[PDB]
Amino acid sequence: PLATTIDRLRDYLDRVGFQQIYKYIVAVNHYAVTPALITRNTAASVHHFFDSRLGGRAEFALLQCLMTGRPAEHAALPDKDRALADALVTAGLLRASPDGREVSGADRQLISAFGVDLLIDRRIHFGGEVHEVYIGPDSYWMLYYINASGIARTHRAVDLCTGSGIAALYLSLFTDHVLATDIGDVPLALVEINRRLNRRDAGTMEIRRENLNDTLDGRERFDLLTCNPPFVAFPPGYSGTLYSQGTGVDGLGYMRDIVGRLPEVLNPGGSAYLVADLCGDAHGPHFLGELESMVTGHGMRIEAFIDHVLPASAQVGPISDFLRHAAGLPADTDIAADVQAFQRETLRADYYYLTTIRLQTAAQNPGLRMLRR
Ligand SMILES: Nc1ncnc2c1ncn2[C@@H]1O[C@H](CSCC[C@H](N)C(=O)O)[C@@H](O)[C@H]1O
Ligand SMILES: [Ca+2]
Ligand code: NA
C-alpha cells in the first residue's frame, strides 16, 4: 500500500509540474545553494505566490500541503488529488484535521534538489521539535563538486550515511549501480520512500542497513564514493544525535575511517567526495594536515574546497542551542562555557571551515590542493 501511495504521489507531482514550480519559486541562483529555502520564515510568501501568481488553483492545493504544510479543504481538492490525500494521511505523510474537513502537513516537507524530488524532515525548517533526518547546505555542496559527465553507467557508486537519500539519488541519475547505506530507522524508511518517488528500485539502487566501518572493511570496490558523515564534536558528557555527533576526540573519527580505507575501497582512479565542517586555525582546517600521508603514502590527489568560514565564537550559540534542544536540558545549564573550553583546549578551533574534499586514487597529478577565497 505504501508503494502504491508513493507511485500515486509521483503521478501527482508529474501532473502539476512540481519540480518546475519549486525551481521557479527558489530560482536558479538559489536552487543548489541550500535546502533551507522554503521554511517557516518564507512560507507566507510561498502561499502568496500560489494565491496571487498561480491564482489559487485547486490543482496546487495538495502540493502546498506537501511543500509548506498549508491546509487545504478536503472537499476543495480535485477528485484524483483527494483520494491521494487520503492515502497520504493513512501513510502518516500528511495530517487530517480532527473533523476530517482539511488536509495539512505532517513531519515531511517536499523539496527538489539536484534534479531529484525529495521528502525531508519538515522539522528542520519548521516548528519546534528536533528533527530526526538531516539535510543541509553541506549536503548540497558535496554533490556540487561531482563531475557528472565523468560517471559511466557501469560505474559502481556508494553513498555512505545516506540520510534522506539525496546523494544516492543524485548518483542514480548517472550510474545504474548505487549503494546507499545508513543505520537509523527513520532515515532508512525515508530513503526507501524517496527511491520509489524517483522511479528507482533495488535493480539500480540498493538500500542497506550497515555501519559505515563495516562497508569500508568489505570486499566491494567502488568507482565513486560520497559521504557526509556525522562530524560535529560536542564536549564530553553531552548527548547529540545520530546524524550530528562524530566519533573520536575531535568529532572527525568517521572522516579518518573513510580516508584510511580509500586506497582499498576505491578502484584505481576512483574518486571520493566528503564534506565536513572542519576545525582549524587562521591558515586552514587541521584535518587537511592529516591528508599529506595519503598524497605521499598512496599517490592520491586531494582537493579541498572551503566554501564557508566562521569564527569559533559564532558556533558557540548554535552548538549550545542544539545540545540543549536535543537532550531537553533546562535553560540554566552553562553549555556555552563548556563548548568554548572544548573548542579551545581539545579542538584548537579558532575557525570552522565548511570543506568539501575530493580524493582520487592513482592520480597522475598527485598532491594536496586547498582552495580558499
Ligand atoms: N556509523 C554509521 N554508519 C552509517 N550511517 C551512519 C552512522 N552513523 C550515523 N549515520 C547516519 O549518517 C547520516 C549523517 S547526515 C548526512 C545525510 C545525507 N548523506 C546528507 O548529506 O544530507 C545520518 O543519516 C545518520 O543516520
Ligand atoms: Ca523566492
Ligand atoms: Na554530517
Q: Whose CA is nearest to atom 11 of ligand 1?
A: 161
Name the grid cell of 233.
564534536
**Which residue is closest in CA terms to ligand 1's atom 24?**
163
- Under DSSP, the state recorded for 285 is B
Helices (H), 156-298: 166-172, 185-197, 212-217, 253-265, 292-298
287 contact partners, CB below 8 Å, separation of at least 6: 252, 255, 276, 278, 279, 280, 355
> Rounded CA gap, 124 and 30, in Å?
18
CB 279 within 8 A of CB 352: yes
DSSP annotation of 29 reads T
Q: Which of 125, 161, 164, 256 is the pocket-test mutation for ligand 1 (most atoms within 8 Å of CB)?
A: 161
Q: Which amino acid is at 77?
A: L
In terms of Cβ atoms closer than 10 Å to its own Cβ (0-12, 13-18, 19+), residue 209 is: exposed
3-state secondary structure of 156: coil
Closest alpha carbon to 77 in 99, 54, 63, 59: 59
- CA dist 2 and 148 (Å) reads 32
* Domain assignments of the chain as residue spans, ordered by start: 2-108, 130-371
Resolution value in angstroms: 1.5
Quickly count: other Cβ atoms within 10 Å of residue 317's Cβ: 12
The atom number, within ligand 1, closest to the CA of 167 reads 19
Determine the 3-state secondary structure of 305 from DSSP.
Answer: strand
User: For residue 261, what is its C-alpha cell?
Assistant: 580505507
Residues of the chain with a following break (C to N over 2.5 Å): none
User: Residue 117: enclosing H or E segment and its boundaries?
Assistant: strand 116-121
CB-CB contact of 293 with 370 (8 Å): no
Is residue 245 classed as helix, strand or coil in its secondary structure? strand
| Phi/psi at 196 (5° precision) | -65, -35
Running DSSP on this structure, what letter comes out for residue 263? H
* Whether the Cβ atoms of residue 142 and residue 274 lie closer than 8 Å to each other: yes
CB 71, CB 63: distance < 8 Å:
no
3-class SS of residue 72: strand
Top CATH class of 130-371 equals alpha beta
Nearest CA to ligand 1 atom 23: 243
List all residues whose CB is within 6 A of at least one atom of ligand 1.
134-135, 139, 161-164, 166-167, 181-184, 187, 211-212, 228-230, 242-243
75, three cell numbers: 472537499
In 3D, which of 360, 140, 138 has the Cα closest to residue 270? 360
Q: Please, is 302 exposed, middle or buried when counting C-beta atoms within 10 Å of its C-beta (0-12, 13-18, 19+)?
A: buried
Q: Residue 362 is inside which H or E element, if any?
A: none
Q: What is the DSSP string of 208-242?
A: EE--HHHHHHSS--EEEEEE----B---TT----T
Q: Which residues contact 169 (CB under 8 A, 6 or more apart)?
A: 116, 118, 194, 195, 198, 200, 205
Contact 339, 314 (CB under 8 A): no
Q: Collapsing DSSP states into helix, strand and coil, what is residue 141?
A: helix
The string of DSSP letters for 326-340 reads: HHT--TT--HHHHHH
Separation of CA 49 and ligand 2 centre (Å): 9
Please tell me the distance from the alpha carbon of residue 32 to that of residue 200, in angstroms, as a whole number. 22
Our measurement of the distance from residue 192's CA atom to the centroid of its chain's CA atoms, rounded to an integer in Å, reads: 15
* CA–CA distance, 10 with 15 (Å, rounded to integer): 9
